[PDB]
Design a binder for this molecule. Structure first.
Ligand SMILES: CSC[C@H]1O[C@@H](n2cnc3c(N)ncnc32)[C@H](O)[C@@H]1O
Ligand SMILES: O=S([O-])[O-]
Ligand SMILES: [Zn+2]
Ligand SMILES: [Zn+2]
Ligand SMILES: [Zn+2]
Ligand SMILES: [Zn+2]
Length: 270
């Protein structure tokens, strides 16, 4: 009630509707916020990236614990409310689409993630140098992020998560926890950078996972013909490709790496 009332009061004070769009929901539970923050072990030395501060409930908690918070927000009207409603010495608001603007240097991310950017944000983050991220997604998307090779929901996002991160779902978050109540539950995800990162070619993985249900001979032939190359000058090389008895969705990052190295050696991806 206490944080839901306070939301209701802010929205009417400014006279703004709770969403311009349809993949956006406001965390209105004090203890989930404080749980996100204790899971990330935010300390007086940390420099934190937040995305989509909304009405700044999470932001405000981060500002009182961290050295510096950078928070990225697309809606210029939200930004004006944040500036009038709060008095942080150590918060830097960046107007922008979080998927497009240059990110600050940070050592951690503590953030609710607007669900519409769940995928693009995650790929961008997995390619950053951060100590620890604690982030909220829909539960379906979080189950994808920890899907195992050869399982039915395993996809490009799963591979890159496994290849580049250690990913833990920390707990379910009930739909009661946001306004307006989502139609499915969310999940609090911990991501640390993998100690021994497997660095894979983006174009290759996109190629392979364009249709992840195919065998890897098939997947490779199609993607490289689509680029504009002859089929005849590609067939024989592809049919000594390693892991060729797998469908793409069954591939470990290690196996994708061998396909890369193989294609690299035959000058296809160079
Ligand atoms: C976290 S759920 C709500 C907040 O996310 C913000 N938001 C939505 N989409 C984006 C985006 N692409 N980049 C940054 N902030 C966003 C909205 O303005 C809202 O305040
Ligand atoms: O609108 S929410 O359910 O993505
Ligand atoms: Zn405050
Ligand atoms: Zn689905
Ligand atoms: Zn053709
Ligand atoms: Zn194999």
């Amino acid at each position: 009630s206490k944080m839901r009332d306070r939301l209701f009061f802010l929205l009417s004070k400014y006279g703004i509707r709770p969403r311009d769009s349809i993949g956006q929901h406001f965390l209105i539970i004090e203890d989930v916020i404080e749980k996100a923050i204790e899971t990330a072990n935010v300390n007086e030395n940390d420099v934190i990236l937040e995305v989509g501060p909304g009405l700044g409930f999470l932001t405000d908690e981060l500002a009182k614990r961290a050295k510096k918070v950078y928070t990225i927000e697309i809606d210029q009207k939200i930004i004006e409310i944040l500036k009038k409603e709060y008095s942080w010495n150590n918060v830097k608001i960046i107007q922008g689409d979080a998927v497009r603007v240059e990110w600050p240097k940070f050592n951690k991310v503590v953030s609710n993630i607007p669900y519409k950017i769940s995928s693009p944000f995650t790929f961008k983050l997995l390619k950053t140098d951060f100590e620890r991220a604690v982030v909220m997604y829909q539960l379906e998307f979080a189950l994808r992020m920890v899907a195992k090779p050869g399982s039915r929901n395993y996809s490009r996002l799963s591979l890159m998560a496994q290849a580049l991160g250690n990913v833990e779902i920390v707990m379910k978050i009930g739909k009661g926890a946001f306004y307006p109540r989502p139609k499915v539950d969310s999940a609090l995800v911990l991501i640390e950078p993998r100690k021994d990162k497997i660095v894979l070619n983006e174009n290759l993985v996109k190629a392979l996972f364009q249709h992840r249900r195919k065998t890897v001979p098939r997947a490779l032939k199609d993607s490289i013909h689509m680029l504009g190359v002859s089929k005849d000058e590609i067939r024989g090389i592809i049919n000594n490709v390693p892991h060729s008895n797998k469908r793409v969705f069954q591939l470990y990052p290690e196996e994708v790496k061998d396909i890369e190295e193989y294609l690299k050696k035959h000058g296809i991806i160079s």
